[PDB]
A paper describes a structure:
We show that gacA is an essential gene of GAS that encodes a metal‐independent dTDP‐4‐dehydrorhamnose reductase representative of a new class of monomeric RmlD enzymes. Bioinformatics analysis suggests that gacA encodes a dTDP‐4‐dehydrorhamnose reductase, an enzyme that catalyzes the final step in the production of dTDP‐L‐rhamnose. In general, RmlD enzymes are members of the large short‐chain dehydro‐genases/reductases (SDR) superfamily, which act on a wide family of substrates and commonly form homo‐dimeric or multimeric complexes (Kavanagh et al., 2008). GAS expresses a characteristic SCWP known as Lancefield Group A Antigen or Group A Carbohydrate (GAC).
To unravel why GacA functions as a monomer, we employed X‐ray crystallography. Crystals diffracted routinely below 1.2 Å and were subjected to synchrotron data collection. Consistent with our SEC and activity studies, GacA crystallized as a monomer. GacA contains the typical α‐helical/β‐sheet arrangement known as Rossmann fold present in SDR domains. In agreement with the well‐characterized SeRmlD (Blankenfeldt et al., 2002), the GacA β‐sheet is formed of six β‐strands, in the order 213457. This β‐sheet is flanked by three and four α‐helices on either side, respectively. The second 310‐helix η2 observed in SeRmlD (Blankenfeldt et al., 2002) is missing in GacA due to a shorter loop connecting α‐helix α7 and β‐strand β7. In comparison with SeRmlD, α8 from GacA lacks two α‐helical turns, due to a deletion of eight amino acids in GacA. No symmetry‐related GacA molecule forms protein–protein interactions via α1 and α10 as observed in SeRmlD (Blankenfeldt et al., 2002).
Author numbering: -3 to 283
Write the structure that this text describes.
């Protein structure tokens, strides 16, 4: 009751690493676990860590995020991590009375919203990808078992501390002169630093429990193509805009998953545009 005790799961991924370093800057202590310390798919290992740590606040950064793979070769792994693992951590948090910050996805929505319109927290999820379906089940487990929760739906996540679309683009551009990127899937990038700061803003300021949408912002419509054009603008590659029909993709990704950020902005947190965040990401990567 008098001591805050933070646990970070998925601590060595792009978001978990970002979050560790942010807490380190703020002089905040924590216990950090990932797959080599606490397999979230094994309820007994999860219980043993919570019994030792006795957390009051858990930032759950563990997820499976390979969308195409989740439809086929990774379908079993996607389900274990996003369904079972989410349930296990939600139940552990409820047992121990811990607040759970659960990171979810814009891919819970069906994506059938005109360009220009945006998804709000109270819209009904109806995911059409296996990844999104599993993440929605995770949300439902959190709501059932963790009385004190923040579910933060984020999008298109990138940062300096793990794999993502930015590094994929840069690697491909080293050896290939032409890349084809969809220009009919609308959404917004999210820098891990902005997301980690928002996670901490909710908890530091004890905002109302519930659901919050968080991506970086944009004044104008944004597609994957727009993001890739910007990332690669200093490279000798041509980024070619294509439609989603151009090549046979395994997952039917949402055509418009742009989130309304008004609730997040109502917290007082200030959200950079994705252009600003990308620039900051490049500067932070110099260290």
């Amino acid at each position: 009751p008098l001591l805050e005790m933070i646990l970070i799961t998925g601590s060595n991924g792009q978001l978990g690493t970002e979050l560790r370093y942010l807490l380190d800057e703020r002089g905040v202590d924590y216990v950090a676990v990932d797959v080599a310390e606490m397999d979230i798919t094994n309820e007994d290992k999860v219980e043993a860590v919570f019994a030792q740590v006795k957390p009051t606040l858990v930032y759950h950064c563990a997820a499976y995020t390979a969308v195409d793979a989740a439809e086929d070769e990774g379908k079993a792994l996607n389900e274990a991590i996003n369904v079972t693992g989410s349930e296990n951590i939600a139940k552990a948090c409820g047992k121990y009375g811990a607040t759970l910050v659960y990171i979810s996805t814009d891919y819970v929505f069906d994506g059938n919203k005109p360009v220009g319109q945006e998804w709000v927290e109270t819209d009904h999820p109806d995911p059409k990808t296996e990844y999104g379906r599993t993440k929605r089940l995770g949300e439902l487990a959190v709501e059932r078992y963790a009385e004190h929760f923040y579910i933060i739906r984020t999008a298109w996540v990138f940062g300096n501390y793990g794999k993502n679309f930015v590094f994929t683009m840069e690697q491909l551009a080293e050896n290939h002169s032409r890349l084809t990127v969809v220009n009919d899937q609308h959404g917004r990038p999210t820098w891990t630093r902005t997301l980690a700061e928002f996670m901490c803003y909710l908890t530091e300021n004890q905002k109302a429990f519930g659901y919050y949408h968080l991506s970086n912002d944009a004044k104008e419509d944004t597609t994957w193509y727009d993001f890739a054009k910007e990332i690669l603008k200093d490279k000798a590659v041509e980024v070619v805009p294509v439609d989603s029909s151009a090549f046979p993709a395994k997952a039917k990704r949402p055509l418009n998953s742009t989130m309304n950020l008004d609730k997040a902005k109502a917290t007082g947190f200030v959200i950079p545009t994705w252009q600003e965040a990308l620039k900051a990401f490049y500067q932070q990567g110099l260290k």
